[PDB]
């Protein structure tokens, strides 16, 4: 796993693969969840522990939390998605802020039954996960963390759902239904591959 | 009477309670190094909105200070104990980043305080200097001391003197000018401050 190698071996270097992926992924995933951190303010927060701009207290805290959640997801690569894992992600994400189980079980079982994981598998997983809506809040962001995990674990294109096309993301999700994931598949396919965009950082 | 109103009307929009909290915390936190402006503190307290430039520690300790303030008001007339101070300290530093004469001397200070026949501003000033000299915690000693000072004033229906930040550092200079047995500088500093109750008299003497 050439990409994963560089990624895991650069965690404590600024402008490194790990920190670029972290910054980019979180900027977009958080902004889609309503965060008001600019890309500059997010870097300042992550690198220097300094808050700037106008934010709800929840935005500040969840943004800080999303940093720990990202690290946990990278640390957990190749671990099975379980209830403990998903609950832990959600609990970390909302720390210090203001028939689900059977359906989730069925989804996870379906996922690990696949001969191979593809972007199509990941899109179907994402839609079904969001349709289940297992948590009271934060389902979108938890689902996107899981998409990232699944892309990294299987050496697939790293497609970062983007603020620039956030409308396309949520509207393509809404346009899916059980048995039809084409709108989301097409959206994800339209996205640039992070690995290629930043090939200079790892190959 | 002031205290009755302070508690009674606390839930009003921009209540006397909120004004006291905002004014006390703005100064107590700024003296401790917070960079929240008066405007940004009000936005945080009233609307849970963070503005300006701050360390994450500053944001968190400022938020913690709001809860600690509520705790202090909620527990008026309850005695200052070692555990009480430990709890204020723990809450103030929550979610952030010889030395053993402290326990008896702090215990001595507490028993000395509750052995007084009448609590005055003089007693409160002496308590404050001795508390800060003892310096029982690694951090937050100034803020905890000022919380305790406010508690002592409220509990004894004394003039409410809010220690203020100013460009000349008059409060810190008054503390540093004191010595054991000489609290005149701090007593005089507190004497020079206006009574909060008077400054906001239309918020509790009106009706």
Strand partners, A55: B50
CA separation for the pair B1, A148 (Å, rounded): 60
Cα–Cα separations (whole angstroms), residue B128 to A137, B121, B174: 46, 10, 12
May I ask the CATH class of domain A1-203? mainly alpha
Distances B193 to A51, A70, A115, B72, B144 between C-alpha atoms, Å: 34, 50, 76, 22, 20
Q: Cβ-count burial of B92 within 10 angstroms (0-12 exposed, 13-18 middle, 19+ buried)? A: buried
Residue with tokens 């994931």: A181
Q: Give the CATH fold of the B1-207 domain.
A: Fic-like fold (1.10.3290)
Looking from the CA of B63 toward its CB, the CA atoms found within 13 Å total 23
How far is residue B130's CA from residue A186's CA, in Å, rounded to a whole number?
70
* Resolution value in angstroms: 1.8
Residue of B48, B59, B95 lying closest to A51 (CB–CB):
B59
Contact between residue B125 and residue B186 where contact means Cβ atoms under 8 Å apart: yes
How close, in Å, is residue A70 to chain B by CA atoms?
A: 19
Nearest-angstrom CA–CA distance, B187 and B169: 16
3 state SS of B100: helix
**Backbone gaps in chain A, preceding residues (C–N over 2.5 A):** 98
CA distances from A119 to A154, B28, B125 (A): 10, 55, 69
Least Cα distance to A70 among A13, A145, A163, A19 occurs for A145
- Find chain A residues with C-beta within 8 A of B46's C-beta: none
Length of chain A: 203
Q: Could you count the other beta carbons within 10 Å of the beta carbon of residue B68?
A: 25
Angle CA A148–A151–A155, to nearest 5: 145
**Structure tokens, B175:** 């503390």
Q: Are A73 and A26 in contact (CB under 8 A)?
A: no
Taking contacts as CB-CB distances below 8 angstroms, the residues of chain A near B50 are 51, 54-57, 59-60
Q: Which of A55, A57, A64 is facing B63, going by the closest CB pair?
A: A57
Distance (Å, whole) CA A29 – CA A27: 6
Query: Which chain A residues contact residue B54 at CB under 8 A?
Result: 50-51
Interface touch A49/B57, C-beta < 8 Å: yes
């Amino acid at each position: 796993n050439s990409f994963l190698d560089k990624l895991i071996e650069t965690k404590e270097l600024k402008n490194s693969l790990y920190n670029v992926l972290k910054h980019n992924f979180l900027y977009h995933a958080n902004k889609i969840a309503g965060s008001t951190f600019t890309t500059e303010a997010l870097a300042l927060l992550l690198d220097k522990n300094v808050v700037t701009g106008r934010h709800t207290l929840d935005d500040v805290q969840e943004t800080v939390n999303s940093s720990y959640v990202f690290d946990t997801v990278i640390d957990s690569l190749k671990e099975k998605i379980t209830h403990n894992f998903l609950r832990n992600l959600h609990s970390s994400l909302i720390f210090n802020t203001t028939e689900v189980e059977p359906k989730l079980d069925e989804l996870i079982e379906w996922y690990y039954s696949q001969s191979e994981v593809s972007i199509k598998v990941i899109a179907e997983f994402h839609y079904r996960f969001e349709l289940i809506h297992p948590f009271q809040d934060g389902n979108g962001r938890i689902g996107r963390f899981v998409m990232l995990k699944q892309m990294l674990e299987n050496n697939l294109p790293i497609k970062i759902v983007s603020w620039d096309s956030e409308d396309l993301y949520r509207n393509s999700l809404n346009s899916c239904s059980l048995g039809n994931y084409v709108p989301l598949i097409e959206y994800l396919s339209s996205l640039e591959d992070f690995r290629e965009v930043y090939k200079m950082l790892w190959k």
